[PDB]
Design a protein around this ligand. Structure first.
Ligand SMILES: CC(=O)N[C@H]1[C@H]([C@H](O)[C@H](O)CNC(=O)c2ccc(-c3ccccc3)cc2)O[C@@](OCc2cccc(Cl)c2Cl)(C(=O)O)C[C@@H]1O
Ligand SMILES: *[C@@H]1O[C@H](CO)[C@@H](O[C@@H]2O[C@H](CO)[C@@H](O[C@@H]3O[C@H](CO)[C@@H](O)[C@H](O)[C@@H]3O)[C@H](O)[C@H]2NC(C)=O)[C@H](O)[C@H]1NC(C)=O
Length: 298
């Protein structure tokens, strides 16, 4: 092919930040003679030339420039806008001319007014006491504007270490943060926030997810002489109360000192007359959960 370009389809940024556009190319007609960066170019069919605002011209050309061309005449078309503005948003046009040929390359530059939020990616299955990696992705990375990704649990910064990686190549531009932590059952339903911050820790944007932590049933056991009176062969009722269970429970059974009881497959244990330790067991798709032992005495 005469002109082959490699660059991201779209580059993202927000007002006041910067944008770094990785770009490589190759023209079979040799080195370039002119480069012009257009903003929303329009081909003028009359004059057979391109019109529109010009952000950079190789004929008129520094490090004190907002728009910079970090490339050369043979293989590099990297662009830098520092700072980038909402008006730069749109379709950039890399208008290049070789010895005998011409070419126009389109790069999409999506600049939002406010910093856009990152994205949390949850694994489909999170369960109590099983280490899980949470990933926070941001489709942005520019050297002139360093950022950071902060993990929060119920608005509180998390103490677990988070590996932060960045990519700024012709294929993809992102900032990635991976957090490893072992959740407990109480993390179910709580909010995790990936907060985007600038170099000094100033808030920019955030994404939140409500955790879904599967766990065995957590059981509250209540006995209704309040303790252990009976003193004869009285009537005692014991109830098994599920404090939390994800997913919902399936079966319930009562156990004395060790072995399950006679056909006691209900949430209430009714004794009408056997004076050991008692506890209930409730199961869900995760597995069985037990309650604390109650000691009945005559
Ligand atoms: C090797 C070769 O074929 N070179 C010829 C070169 C390539 O074919 C041309 O660059 C390849 N890209 C495109 O088509 C292109 C790129 C970007 C955008 C765009 C759109 C919206 C926003 C931002 C960007 C649109 C099209 O096209 C030329 O004429 C272009 C021409 C002529 C008449 C009528 C029209 Cl409408 C047009 Cl676009 C030239 O000088 O660019 C002659 C050269 O000889
Ligand atoms: C096209 O050519 C330009 C210029 O040679 C290349 O830009 C250079 O890219 C490197 C990264 O590969 C930049 O290094 C960075 O420096 C900052 C500190 O300024 C540092 O914190 C980073 O970790 C990184 O090391 C370098 O500054 C930059 N040069 C200029 C003048 O901006 C560009 O990579 C080339 N494009 C491709 C697609 O290869």
């Amino acid at each position: 092919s005469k002109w082959v370009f490699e660059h991201p389809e779209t580059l993202y940024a927000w007002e006041g930040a910067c944008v770094w556009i990785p770009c490589t190319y190759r023209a079979l007609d040799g080195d370039l003679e002119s480069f012009i960066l257009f903003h929303n170019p329009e081909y003028n069919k009359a004059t057979s030339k391109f019109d529109g605002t010009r952000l950079y011209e190789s004929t008129k050309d520094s490090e004190q420039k907002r728009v910079q061309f970090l490339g050369d005449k043979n293989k590099n078309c990297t662009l830098s806008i520092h700072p980038v503005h909402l008006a730069d948003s749109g379709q950039l046009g890399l208008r290049m001319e070789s010895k005998t040929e011409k070419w126009m390359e389109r790069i999409h530059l999506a600049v939002s007014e406010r910093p856009f939020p990152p994205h949390i990616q949850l694994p489909p299955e999170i369960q109590e006491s099983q280490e899980v990696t949470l990933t926070c992705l941001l489709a942005f990375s520019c050297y002139g504007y360093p950022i950071q990704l902060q993990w929060l649990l119920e608005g509180v910064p998390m103490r677990q270490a988070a590996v932060t990686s960045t990519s700024l190549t012709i294929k993809s531009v992102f900032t990635r943060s991976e957090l490893k932590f072992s959740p407990q059952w109480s993390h179910h339903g709580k909010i995790v926030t990936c907060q985007l911050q600038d170099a000094d820790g100033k808030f920019l944007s955030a994404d939140t997810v409500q955790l879904n932590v599967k766990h065995t049933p957590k059981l509250e056991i209540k006995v209704t002489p309040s303790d252990a009176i009976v003193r004869e062969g009285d009537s005692v009722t014991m109830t098994c109360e599920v404090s939390s269970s994800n997913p919902e429970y399936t079966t319930v059974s009562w156990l004395k000192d060790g072995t399950s009881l006679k056909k006691q497959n209900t949430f209430t244990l009714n004794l009408r007359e056997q004076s050991g330790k008692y506890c209930c067991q409730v199961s869900n798709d995760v597995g069985p959960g037990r309650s604390e032992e109650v000691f009945l005495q005559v």
